[PDB]
Amino acid sequence: TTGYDAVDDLLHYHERGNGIQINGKDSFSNEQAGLFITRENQTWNGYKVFGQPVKLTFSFPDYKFSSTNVAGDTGLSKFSAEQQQQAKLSLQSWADVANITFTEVAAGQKANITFGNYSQDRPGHYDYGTQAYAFLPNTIWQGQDLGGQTWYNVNQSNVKHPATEDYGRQTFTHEIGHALGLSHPGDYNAGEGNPTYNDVTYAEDTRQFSLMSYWSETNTGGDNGGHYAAAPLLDDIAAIQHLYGANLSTRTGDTVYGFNSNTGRDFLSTTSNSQKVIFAAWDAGGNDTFDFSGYTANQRINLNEKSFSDVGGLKGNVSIAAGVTIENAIGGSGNDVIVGNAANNVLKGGAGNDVLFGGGGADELWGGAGKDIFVFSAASDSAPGASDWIRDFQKGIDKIDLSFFNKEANSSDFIHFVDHFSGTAGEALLSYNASSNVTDLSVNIGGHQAPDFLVKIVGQVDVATDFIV
Ligand SMILES: CCCCCCCC
Ligand SMILES: CCCCCCCC
Ligand SMILES: CCCCCC
Ligand SMILES: CCCCCC
Ligand SMILES: [Ca+2]
Ligand SMILES: [Ca+2]
Ligand SMILES: [Ca+2]
Ligand SMILES: [Ca+2]
Ligand SMILES: [Ca+2]
Ligand SMILES: [Ca+2]
Ligand SMILES: [Ca+2]
Ligand SMILES: [Zn+2]
Numbered sequence: 001t002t003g004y005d006a007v008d009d010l011l012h013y014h015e016r017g018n019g020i021q022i023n024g025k026d027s028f029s030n031e032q033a034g035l036f037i038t039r040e041n042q043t044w045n046g047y048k049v050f051g052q053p054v055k056l057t058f059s060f061p062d063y064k065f066s067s068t069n070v071a072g073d074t075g076l077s078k079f080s081a082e083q084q085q086q087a088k089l090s091l092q093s094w095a096d097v098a099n100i101t102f103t104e105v106a107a108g109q110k111a112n113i114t115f116g117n118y119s120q121d122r123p124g125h126y127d128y129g130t131q132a133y134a135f136l137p138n139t140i141w142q143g144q145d146l147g148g149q150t151w152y153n154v155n156q157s158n159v160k161h162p163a164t165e166d167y168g169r170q171t172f173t174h175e176i177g178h179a180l181g182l183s184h185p186g187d188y189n190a191g192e193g194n195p196t197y198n199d200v201t202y203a204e205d206t207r208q209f210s211l212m213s214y215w216s217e218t219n220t221g222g223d224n225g226g227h228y229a230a231a232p233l234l235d236d237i238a239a240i241q242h243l244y245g246a247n248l249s250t251r252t253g254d255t256v257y258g259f260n261s262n263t264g265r266d267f268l269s270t271t272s273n274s275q276k277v278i279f280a281a282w283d284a285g286g287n288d289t290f291d292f293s294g295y296t297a298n299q300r301i302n303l304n305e306k307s308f309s310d311v312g313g314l315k316g317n318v319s320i321a322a323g324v325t326i327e328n329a330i331g332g333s334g335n336d337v338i339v340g341n342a343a344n345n346v347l348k349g350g351a352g353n354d355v356l357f358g359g360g361g362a363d364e365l366w367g368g369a370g371k372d373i374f375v376f377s378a379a380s381d382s383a384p385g386a387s388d389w390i391r392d393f394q395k396g397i398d399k400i401d402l403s404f405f406n407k408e409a410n411s412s413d414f415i416h417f418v419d420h421f422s423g424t425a426g427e428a429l430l431s432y433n434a435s436s437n438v439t440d441l442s443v444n445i446g447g448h449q450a451p452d453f454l455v456k457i458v459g460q461v462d463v464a465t466d467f468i469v
Helices: 003-011 030-037 081-097 166-180 234-244 403-409
Strands: 054-059 100-104 113-118 120-122 132-134 149-153 256-258 279-281 289-291 300-302 318-320 328-330 337-339 346-348 355-357 364-366 373-375 399-401 427-433 438-443 453-458
Touching: 003 300, 003 337, 003 355, 003 373, 003 399, 003 403, 030 234, 081 100, 081 113, 081 166, 081 234, 113 166, 132 166, 149 166, 166 234, 234 279
Parallel strands: 054 100, 054 113, 113 149, 256 289, 279 318, 289 328, 300 337, 328 346, 337 355, 346 364, 355 373, 373 399
Antiparallel strands: 132 149, 427 438, 438 453
């Protein structure tokens, strides 16, 4: 496979929406999913009141063991220090993406969102079967609003120890989701009390796209390696931003995700190959980097909005929220595929045999060690006046892949190398400056005397060995 083949495959990963079918099910766009997850139309600002900020209180009440909650469960207790710590991180992860402010109040004071443990389904009888539940805003029962109550079965080790059992942390984020107005992404009516993924309303109702789902990411071809996302995923972000608006103040500086992170978020950071990230990135400004340098697996990194990446040996585990521009990416020691976007991108392959694709804008490309391939598929990739730079080219080892053009022209003789331009479309010209150690690659794609494509290359290039055409 060419570099271009790999780029094309990553660009078309998890295509969705526009009426297509997947797994015999309707595919929804990110937007459609956000709307469907919020189909009850309930918010803390009112029924069908969307897009407005909200300020909410939360607490950890000191529930009495023999008391019975509204759902009939008993053996109640207050959240432990560990549970409180993890719940606050879950709250923060929702506040990061939408215009929600959370303020803690005292255990005995009325609060919008509450957290409690229960252990028994009836007095003296421990429940080992259930996990957790919560009430959406404006859930009126016997005259009282149950909205905001969240309840967890502390007999489950993950609920008791969410700091070391990542399904517990996910459960906290999920149930807070309900408390804010999110539903499961389907009702699963056809499953009649024993539902499976086969009963979804839309194909992207899986844990790849939403932590409001209970269906494995494997149903959509994801693979999270036995781990569970801590924080809102791509379609959860669409949902909650529909409800309370997008948080334009979040991470507006130059932000590094992954290794060497300055996010101050556990779920956006790692300090070792064994620590695997799973996240959907929301970022409201600045020059940002996906630093996945410390992973040894073969990775695929796509910097386009709404797109999925294969990071740290997982599949479809990293994504970028709608409306977000991430500028830079750093691969690991594996053989990576790294795809930029229309902005200026710094792309670094690291060790391994990498494929780099800057796309539009003026990109800076570093293959690193290994046999790397730099791919181009439009004159606008590297326009004169905004040229890409390949900073580390090694002749006989690295390659420039222009193969898209002859494939599109269906002619082996469209791109070809000449010693001087004649105005004929397809002509490519190399010019080497031994004094500056810079090679210019100029191509006349559009058919003018002046070329419309110019790549600047640090290093010599050997035309006999270094191209894929
Ligand atoms: C056809 C997509 C529907 C998403 C909006 C929610 C409909 C209840
Ligand atoms: C047990 C009745 C509580 C109200 C239920 C409505 C939320 C599903
Ligand atoms: C099983 C109890 C769930 C209550 C919220 C729907
Ligand atoms: C309440 C819906 C849960 C679905 C898990 C099978
Ligand atoms: Ca940023
Ligand atoms: Ca940015
Ligand atoms: Ca690499
Ligand atoms: Ca680019
Ligand atoms: Ca490399
Ligand atoms: Ca290299
Ligand atoms: Ca470019
Ligand atoms: Zn739920």
